[PDB]
Amino acid sequence: IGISFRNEFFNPQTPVNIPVQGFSNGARLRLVLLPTSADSRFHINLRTPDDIVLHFNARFDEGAVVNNSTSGGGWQSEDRHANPFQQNKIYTLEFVSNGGIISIFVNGAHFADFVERTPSHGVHLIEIEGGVHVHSAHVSH
Amino acid sequence: GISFRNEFFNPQTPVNIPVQGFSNGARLRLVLLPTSADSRFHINLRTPDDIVLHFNARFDEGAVVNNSTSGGGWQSEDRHANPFQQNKIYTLEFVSNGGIISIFVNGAHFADFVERTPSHGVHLIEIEGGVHVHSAHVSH
Ligand SMILES: C[C@@H]1O[C@@H](O)[C@@H](O)[C@H](O)[C@@H]1O[C@@H]1O[C@H](CO)[C@H](O)[C@H](O)[C@H]1O
Ligand SMILES: C[C@@H]1O[C@@H](O)[C@@H](O)[C@H](O)[C@@H]1O[C@@H]1O[C@H](CO)[C@H](O)[C@H](O)[C@H]1O
Ligand SMILES: [Mg+2]
Ligand SMILES: [Mg+2]
Ligand SMILES: [Mg+2]
């Protein structure tokens, strides 16, 4: 398992599954991504050992982003947003976690807030799956 | 394969740390406690072909010796006083400055080491010998 002096990795293979030491107190995850036509959805999960704190799901089949989470392994209430992505275009997607709110930006502009339902301090894994190519992934605490 | 856990605690010696991104400004910070288990310990910063810096604390000789390899053979030593005592805690930091690695102990400059081969491609840190590692941290 390799680490980086800049906490950044290029061209990781999907599905990407990357350990992280919590995701709170101002942690930022920056992804440069290209949604693909290989699947009609892709998602990013910020997972603790027990639950998903945030599941961010881009859905080209439904024309939406769906955010949700699990508690005791069951899905909670969905937040639905417009889909800010187009397949085969490049996006910089950032998540920023502080004070129980995970703020989400696309190409530098605020896209949505997610009010977490389980503490993001317990996050231990960043998972990226589905119809998406990850060009780069970076975490700053 | 890859991890954003750039700081970790209490790894067992010997520690093998696969790394990338050792460029100008990169900093390795270790909190260590030398032990009586062996009269020496060392830190190697390696590329896939050579040791860029072998930092070796020696309680038997009363010195730190720095060196490097070319084609697997040792080059010329730099020898310094030993700043460490067994069973005391030290923060040891190595900073790449794009050709000179600057080494600090407890926040004070200890020594510079002039690289004998470029270190851009350092891919592996090893920590071995009579030392307990409380933490390792890579950053800029
Ligand atoms: C299970 C429901 O089925 C579909 O028709 C969706 O429109 C709903 O959102 C549900 O899908 C599930 O939604 C969760 C998040 O709430 C996950 O995205 C899961 O992958 C998806 O199957
Ligand atoms: C082989 C030499 O043995 C003693 O004379 C030491 O005082 C010298 O420093 C040499 O020791 C070797 O030094 C290299 C670095 O030049 C490595 O530390 C190696 O482990 C050590 O045996
Ligand atoms: Mg399919
Ligand atoms: Mg500089
Ligand atoms: Mg400089």
| Residues A50, A70: Cα–Cα separation, whole Å | 9
Residue of A60, A67, A68, A127 to mutate, ligand 1, most atoms within 8 A of C-beta: A68
Measure CA of the first residue to CA of the last residue in chain A; give whole Å. 20
Resolution of the experimentally solved model in angstroms = 1.5
Q: Is the dihedral of CA A116, A118, A122, A124 positive or negative?
A: negative
**Six-digit token string for A15:** 């599905």
**Six-digit token string for A89:** 């275009």
The amino acid at A26: G
A111 phi-psi bin (left φ>0, alpha ψ -120 to 50, beta other): alpha
Q: Domains in chain A, start-ordered, CATH in brackets?
A: 1-141 (2.60.120.200)
Measure CA of the first residue to CA of the last residue in chain B; give whole Å. 21
| Residues B102, B82: Cα–Cα separation, whole Å | 16
CA dihedral (A119, A122, A126, A127) in degrees, to 10, reads -80
Residue B36: CB atoms within 10 A of its CB come to: 9
Beta bridge partners of B46: B51, B124
Nearest CA in chain B to A1: B1
Residue pair B133/B42 in contact by the 8 Å Cβ criterion: no
Contact residues of A toward B, CB < 8 A: 1-9, 12, 18-21, 126, 139
- Strand bridging mode B15-20 / A3-4: parallel
B2 vs A5, A18, A21: nearest CB? A18
Nearest ligand to the C-alpha of residue B98? 5
- Strand bridging mode A91-98 / A125-130: unpaired
Q: Are B4 and A12 inside 8 Å of each other by CB?
A: no
Nearest residue to B59 via CA among B33, B37, B85: B85
Q: For atom 7 of ligand 1, which residue has the closest CA? A: A62
The DSSP line for B65-108 is: EEE-EETTEE---EEE-----TT--EEEEEEE-SSEEEEEETTE
E strand or H helix at B120: none
